[PDB]
Amino acid sequence: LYYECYSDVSVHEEMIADQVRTEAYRLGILKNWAALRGKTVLDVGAGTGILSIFCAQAGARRVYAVEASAIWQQAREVVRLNGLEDRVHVLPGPVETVELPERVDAIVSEWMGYGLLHESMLSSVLHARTKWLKEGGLLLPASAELFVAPISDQMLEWRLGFWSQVKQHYGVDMSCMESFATRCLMGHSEIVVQDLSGEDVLARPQRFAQLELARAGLEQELEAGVGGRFRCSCYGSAPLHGFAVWFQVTFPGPLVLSTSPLHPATHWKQALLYLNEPVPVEQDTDISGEITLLPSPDNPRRLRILLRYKVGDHEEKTKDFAME
Amino acid sequence: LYYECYSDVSVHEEMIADQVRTEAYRLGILKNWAALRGKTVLDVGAGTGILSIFCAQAGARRVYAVEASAIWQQAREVVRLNGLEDRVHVLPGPVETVELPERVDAIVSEWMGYGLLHESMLSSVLHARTKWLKEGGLLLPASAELFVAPISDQMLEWRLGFWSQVKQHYGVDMSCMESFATRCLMGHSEIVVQDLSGEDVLARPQRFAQLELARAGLEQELEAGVGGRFRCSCYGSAPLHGFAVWFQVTFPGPLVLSTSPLHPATHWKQALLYLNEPVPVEQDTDISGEITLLPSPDNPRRLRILLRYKVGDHEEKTKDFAME
Ligand SMILES: Nc1ncnc2c1ncn2[C@@H]1O[C@H](CSCC[C@H](N)C(=O)O)[C@@H](O)[C@H]1O
Ligand SMILES: Nc1ncnc2c1ncn2[C@@H]1O[C@H](CSCC[C@H](N)C(=O)O)[C@@H](O)[C@H]1O
Ligand SMILES: [Mg+2]
Numbered sequence: 001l002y003y004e005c006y007s008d009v010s011v012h013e014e015m016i017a018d019q020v021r022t023e024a025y026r027l028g029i030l031k032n033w034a035a036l037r038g039k040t041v042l043d044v045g046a047g048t049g050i051l052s053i054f055c056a057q058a059g060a061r062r063v064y065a066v067e068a069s070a071i072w073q074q075a076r077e078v079v080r081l082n083g084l085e086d087r088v089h090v091l092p093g094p095v096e097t098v099e100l101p102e103r104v105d106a107i108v109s110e111w112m113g114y115g116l117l118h119e120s121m122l123s124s125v126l127h128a129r130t131k132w133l134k135e136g137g138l139l140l141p142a143s144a145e146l147f148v149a150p151i152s153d154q155m156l157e158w159r160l161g162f163w164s165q166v167k168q169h170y171g172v173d174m175s176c177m178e179s180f181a182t183r184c185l186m187g188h189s190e191i192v193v194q195d196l197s198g199e200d201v202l203a204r205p206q207r208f209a210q211l212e213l214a215r216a217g218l219e220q221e222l223e224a225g226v227g228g229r230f231r232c233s234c235y236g237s238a239p240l241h242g243f244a245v246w247f248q249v250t251f252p253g254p255l256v257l258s259t260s261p262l263h264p265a266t267h268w269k270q271a272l273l274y275l276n277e278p279v280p281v282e283q284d285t286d287i288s289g290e291i292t293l294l295p296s297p298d299n300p301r302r303l304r305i306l307l308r309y310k311v312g313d314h315e316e317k318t319k320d321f322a323m324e
Numbered sequence: 325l326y327y328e329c330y331s332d333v334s335v336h337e338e339m340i341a342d343q344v345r346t347e348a349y350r351l352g353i354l355k356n357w358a359a360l361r362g363k364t365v366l367d368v369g370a371g372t373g374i375l376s377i378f379c380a381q382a383g384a385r386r387v388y389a390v391e392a393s394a395i396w397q398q399a400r401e402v403v404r405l406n407g408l409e410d411r412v413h414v415l416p417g418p419v420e421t422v423e424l425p426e427r428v429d430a431i432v433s434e435w436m437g438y439g440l441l442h443e444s445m446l447s448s449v450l451h452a453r454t455k456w457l458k459e460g461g462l463l464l465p466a467s468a469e470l471f472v473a474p475i476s477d478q479m480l481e482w483r484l485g486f487w488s489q490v491k492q493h494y495g496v497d498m499s500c501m502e503s504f505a506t507r508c509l510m511g512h513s514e515i516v517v518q519d520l521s522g523e524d525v526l527a528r529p530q531r532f533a534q535l536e537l538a539r540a541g542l543e544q545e546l547e548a549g550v551g552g553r554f555r556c557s558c559y560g561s562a563p564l565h566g567f568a569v570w571f572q573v574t575f576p577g578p579l580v581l582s583t584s585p586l587h588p589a590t591h592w593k594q595a596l597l598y599l600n601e602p603v604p605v606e607q608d609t610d611i612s613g614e615i616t617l618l619p620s621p622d623n624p625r626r627l628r629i630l631l632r633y634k635v636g637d638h639e640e641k642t643k644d645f646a647m648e
């Protein structure tokens with residue numbers, strides 16, 4: 001028989017083979033052994049079940065593994081295979097309408113998407129917190145932070161300059177293809193998911209928002225837009241291509257899971273915001289601006305980022321991006 | 325302004341940055357200096373124009389660079405930038421309806437797609453040959469050959485076995501996810517474009533068809549299906565995952581451009597035909613079958629491959645694939 005589930009397995013394969021992500025959760029859960037032992041847990045978006053099994057292994061008395069997509073069936077098999085069917089219960093469907101037999105002492109969730117909020121799953125976690133978490137209960141991870149940095153993307157620089165290198169390799173001048181390539185690769189309003197490294201970072205990364213996930217008002221902050229202003233000074237001479245956005249989350253003890261290009265790579269990579277064309281900058285060129293993360297009005301699952309930026313003495317500009 | 329041309333630049337970037345492909349054409353054209361010097365050339369599907377410029381640099385008196393897609397505008401700029409606007413003429417639209425002022429002494433074309441015939445551009449080259457090529461004129465490349473080999477895809481083997489390795493890395497048994505992963509990654513009828521190496525090849529590659537591009541009847545062979553039977557003996561014990569198909573083309577002198585996994589990688593990679601699940605084989609396991617390349621009836625641009633195969637003493641089986 002033929003099945004149409006390639007993407008289902010591949011997304012969960014990518015997450016579990018992400019050792020930074022999976023080991024950070026494993027250890028962040030283990031570090032909360034004191035708060036979980038003999039207690040009850042809700043795993044929001046349990047996927048293949050691995051975080052719910054981690055919670056049971058951390059001492060949890062009972063875990064409700066709630067999963068809306070078709071992969072829930074695999075999670076129930078994984079639970080049984082690990083001998084945990086008496087303590088980890090896999091519940092299909094959205095956490096917003098699942099029926100648990102009790103409120104829970106803790107919620108664990110791997111809810112983050114590209115640019116932190118793509119897929120807009122955080123609202124489901126907060127809904128579950130309001131509906132099912134006991135007063136003073138535990139949320140894992142407990143907080144998120146958002147970061148921005150100006151970038152000179154080395155790979156993009158090579159792709160753009162490639163056309164002027166053709167003469168050196170084939171004896172045909174194609175340097176007029178550079179304006180065309182720049183229009184096509186940068187003159188669009190899509191957020192580009194790409195992994196960078198420290199070689200690409202043009203100034204000290206700036207924290208522009210800090211989200212305490214249990215805080216009053218956050219569900220409404222998410223609808224109005226999460227973000228803030230930033231300011232930085234360029235390290236050296238380079239073409240500025242735009243900005244990279246990334247995040248970390250923290251497990252209280254604390255253990256930090258980072259998606260920074262200065263840190264080990266993860267499947268989240270970074271969310272890149274390209275200007276329409278490169279801007280030359282030098283050492284100590286001042287850059288300031290504002291970043292807002294928003295749901296897109298067409299598809300609230302889809303991340304929108306509104307960028308305001310000012311490079312040196314240029315006028316401030318605005319560019320409105322939506323997830324690729 | 326925002327443009328929607330990312331894929332246009334990226335496909336031509338991939339071809340020009342493919343040094344195996346581009347240098348083989350450059351040299352295959354140069355090798356025909358005697359047949360091209362002072363003569364006229366039609367470049368079918370000129371793209372960004374580089375092959376037409378190669379022809380002019382090989383001595384051609386006049387080159388008609390015909391291109392149906394929007395990139396034709398870039399080719400006219402490239403021609404002008406190389407000072408060739410008096411001898412290389414860029415004509416937009418399909419070669420089937422272009423008007424040339426003369427018949428031509430030679431046709432050059434980079435028409436090959438994944439699995440050789442995906443995109444079905446060969447029929448356009450043959451149409452142009454019948455309509456515009458002088459009697460006894462030159463076609464570059466002049467021939468193509470098709471190859472098949474049984475494969476044990478090392479990357480696929482790792483992805484499938486990954487689920488049974490989770491216990492060794494996180495202390496959670498996920499080995500039941502293997503049946504699921506196999507269904508999703510192999511239990512489908514799509515041709516998978518993937519680059520392999522010699523490590524993946526399970527028996528001596530077999531040539532199953534040879535296409536002399538100028539031969540009588542080929543346009544009708546393409547509609548009925550191109551291919552033939554094959555037989556081989558496995559090198560050693562391994563899971564058989566299916567078959568890889570690839571091609572070469574030859575420039576008469578001859579210079580061969582190969583897409584074999586035993587040869588330097590190209591952007592064509594190979595076209596992979598996975599069985600529904602792996603079949604264990606051993607040294608000297610006999611494998612035979614037949615491969616037919618066909619246009620898909622829904623979208624004649626889209627390659628279809630009909631596979632018949634017999635592994636050892638198993639019954640012969642059939643699997644009907646269509647391009648991803
Ligand atoms: N409202 C909701 N209720 C239940 N599951 C949800 C949900 N919103 C998103 N999901 C699911 O949440 C999962 C997030 S991916 C994380 C999977 C798993 N916890 C792991 O860490 O490996 C996906 O499987 C997605 O289908
Ligand atoms: N019938 C047709 N007439 C004109 N161009 C065609 C065509 N069928 C396909 N094409 C074009 O043929 C090109 C094949 S890609 C090869 C591009 C170029 N010769 C190079 O080698 O770099 C594409 O640009 C495609 O748009
Ligand atoms: Mg995610």
Ligand SMILES: [Mg+2]
Binds near residue numbers: 434435436437438
């Ligand atoms: Mg091609």
